[PDB]
Design a protein around this ligand. Structure first.
Ligand SMILES: NC(=O)c1ccc[n+]([C@@H]2O[C@H](COP(=O)([O-])OP(=O)(O)OC[C@H]3O[C@@H](n4cnc5c(N)ncnc54)[C@H](OP(=O)(O)O)[C@@H]3O)[C@@H](O)[C@H]2O)c1
Ligand SMILES: NC(=O)c1ccc[n+]([C@@H]2O[C@H](COP(=O)([O-])OP(=O)(O)OC[C@H]3O[C@@H](n4cnc5c(N)ncnc54)[C@H](OP(=O)(O)O)[C@@H]3O)[C@@H](O)[C@H]2O)c1
Ligand SMILES: [Zn+2]
Ligand SMILES: [Zn+2]
Ligand SMILES: [Zn+2]
Ligand SMILES: [Zn+2]
Lengths: 372, 372
């Protein structure tokens, strides 16, 4: 039994930015009050994890990344009632305290207890449960999944079906984000025309989302044509490679869609892709959703006239989903309403984690996950 | 009888930008096929009219400005069936052809027959119905109301109650825009908190709109405290003057509204004001509507991160209203549901038109109108 005891396990540590993750032996302390220690079963590698390493997204170091996973509760701290040892769960990088303005609302999921703003990289009591070589290691958005065991607040966990597949880990971020961006944020309607920019994990999930919402046309826009067949299989009606064109991609799209698409979803994290997405929508009612994160000091040179005719520009985190909605997604996945496992193009071990980061730059595949 | 004859009348002509409007005697030709000649009863002076004169909004010159009015049909061209001589009407600067993508969709009012993009300043057949000092004079957005008589396309006219008050002219633009920005574009919900930036004709209408939508708090934000009393009278729960604080106005608002308002409406046409409005909304679900038009080359330095948490930024013209909805607005006004006349702080004659433009730079009052 490991309850109430320190656990020694394997984890991928980021001692510094711009450097490959280091496989280390670490110590994971027992959960304190209102905390839950989880044995990670599978973890996905998200573009945001890569961005932290490139300093595109701020974070303290040393740090254990990863925020897309599925696991089983190993033990619970004092006062915990929402889960119990043995329950299968998905860590939430966007918690749900249930009492803040966002949580009490039905139009927001941005719980104020999130650490995306403060970036403390520590637990609620400002201490760390991670130790490596006698040094406290910071966590990522209250999760950290690039480790065999992690500890999270009891408001940052979603209990799910005990038999949920290991591929359910994508629901921890990438899939819920892209899927939700289409279904919740953009609010894609039946028969509408959509365009998705950036065919990575999130982008493919957005394509699946637009299809589920009933779009009549879904245009996948990316620079790696090897992904096109896959994109079509998952819902895209056609794909376009901006590099093939001399004329602006938004002009190409507007010419093909009677003036522009109804909904555009940006999933690359590039100011240029955001601008292309916006201008690819119909000026009279087009809706653009930005999901990607660009360098902190980059800005979108927005001409207000682009919005004046009737356009909308919005953004969201975790597809606008609240933690309490995660289980339902897992259910739909098992009922085959959504085949999340289709997005898993590569399965690796924790030791091969750096390969997943290498693939992120490759011109193929969708999502890589690790089975511990 | 003037049917089928040229009419000689008075009008205010802008021979060139940056100069006072010139009172002239002009000739107005009879309406051609699918056109309607209207005797203007009253016209308001809109900030947009001033912007054209200052070259903030592009236009050919010489031109007769004005796009906010109420009048009566004097005669109709061949094929016209929607109105007849004697009908009271409101010219529409955003037409409704009923056949384009925008007109077929309930989510847009930006009829592709509008002249806001092409700026031809001419009738459909590329000719003008206005002549002054032997020269053809351009029109404004298919309307032009700074003239005793004007000719418009039959898809650019809304028939309204024969007994509609002269003040109904504000529905032609200012009122419909501000009011609609709240009810249609922002979609203000009962019990929400709102902030309106720029207390001019449009701003006051937005206040009226937020109140009609059932907002519990309506914060008027402007640099002229003398307008606050009237603002409160029309629906504002309080007013703030940026100059009375050492910190950014959006920090003051967030501090006073538990993180920011639910809906913010920009009505000044300044990049700085637009940015203040955006950041003044709650990061988890705040909605900002931009209505003002800034200089052509100005750009909003938008940090994507401001949207990622759950904010929406959108814009619209004519408050999102379609031409077919104008009569309903006039009806509500005559039933005292909305007191449009309350926004008229100055009444002039055509000869005094320049005083109205001077007043836009005074710092008091709301809207000026001229009775012909
Ligand atoms: N708001 C949220 O909740 C949320 C959640 C997770 C991730 N994100 C962000 O969303 C983005 C997508 O993440 P993934 O989806 O996790 O990432 P990913 O798999 O790395 O995919 C990003 C995709 O965007 C395109 N891309 C990458 N670099 C590019 C460049 N220099 N120029 C043009 N296109 C480029 C590529 O698409 P093609 O191969 O088709 O060109 C690539 O597959 C990341 O920026 C991530 O941080 C946001
Ligand atoms: N999209 C549409 O359908 C539509 C329709 C009509 C007008 N508009 C636009 O809406 C805006 C306002 O029109 P009105 O409402 O017709 O105009 P207006 O009566 O001139 O009022 C504009 C108001 O904005 C503020 N303002 C103006 N110049 C400013 C400056 N340099 N710095 C700070 N605040 C300033 C003032 O408010 P305070 O005194 O409270 O500071 C002023 O009362 C214009 O930009 C116009 O082009 C859009
Ligand atoms: Zn992620
Ligand atoms: Zn909360
Ligand atoms: Zn139309
Ligand atoms: Zn106007």
């Amino acid at each position: 039994c490991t309850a109430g005891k320190d656990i020694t396990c394997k984890a991928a540590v980021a001692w510094e930015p711009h450097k490959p993750l280091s496989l280390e032996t670490i110590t994971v302390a027992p959960p304190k009050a209102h905390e839950v220690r989880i044995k990670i079963l599978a973890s996905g590698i998200c573009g945001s994890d890569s961005s932290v390493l490139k300093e595109i997204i701020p974070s303290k170091f040393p740090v254990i990344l990863g925020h897309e996973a599925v696991g089983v509760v190993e033990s619970i701290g004092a006062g915990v009632t929402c889960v119990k040892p043995g329950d299968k769960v998905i860590p939430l990088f966007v918690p749900q305290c249930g009492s803040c303005r966002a949580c009490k609302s039905s139009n927001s999921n941005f719980c104020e207890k999130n650490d995306m703003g403060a970036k403390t990289g520590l637990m609620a009591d400002m201490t760390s449960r991670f130790t490596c070589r006698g040094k406290p290691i910071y966590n990522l958005m209250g999760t950290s999944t690039f480790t065999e065991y992690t500890v999270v607040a009891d408001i940052a966990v979603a209990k799910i079906d005990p038999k949920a597949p290991l591929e359910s880990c994508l629901i921890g971020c990438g899939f819920a984000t892209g899927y939700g961006a289409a279904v919740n944020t953009a609010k894609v309607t039946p028969g509408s025309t959509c365009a998705v920019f950036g065919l990575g994990g999130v982008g493919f999930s957005a394509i699946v989302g637009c299809k589920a919402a009933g779009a009549s046309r879904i245009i996948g826009v990316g620079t790696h044509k090897d992904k096109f067949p896959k994109a079509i299989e998952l819902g895209a009606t056609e794909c376009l490679n901006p590099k093939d064109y001399d004329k602006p991609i938004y002009e190409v799209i507007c010419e093909k869609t009677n003036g522009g698409v109804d909904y555009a979803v940006e999933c690359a994290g590039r100011i240029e892709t955001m601008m292309n997405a916006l201008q690819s929508t119909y000026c009279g009612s087009g809706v653009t959703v930005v999901l990607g994160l660009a360098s902190p000091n980059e800005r979108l040179p927005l001409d207000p006239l682009l919005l004046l005719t009737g356009r909308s520009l919005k953004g969201s985190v975790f597809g606008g989903f609240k933690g309490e909605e995660v289980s339902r997604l897992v259910d739909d996945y098992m009922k085959k309403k959504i085949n999340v496992n289709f997005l898993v193009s590569t399965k690796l071990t924790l030791d091969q984690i750096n390969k997943a980061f290498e693939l992120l730059s490759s011109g193929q595949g969708v999502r890589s996950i690790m089975i511990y």
